[PDB]
Write a protein that binds this ligand. Structure first.
Ligand SMILES: [Zn+2]
Ligand SMILES: [Zn+2]
Length: 42
């Protein structure tokens, strides 16, 4: 679900869609670790 708060997700990471968060803020916050891998479909 939201890898930060609540329900499953609204959208998936809008650079790959390999991770998902309930709202937008979660994705921007928590992707600090993910930003390093985004762009690669693995
Ligand atoms: Zn969330
Ligand atoms: Zn991504």
């Amino acid at each position: 679900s939201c890898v930060n708060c609540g329900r499953e997700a609204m959208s998936e990471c809008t650079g790959c869609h390999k991770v998902n968060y309930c709202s937008t803020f979660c994705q921007r916050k928590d992707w600090k670790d993910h930003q390093h891998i985004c762009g690669q479909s693995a």
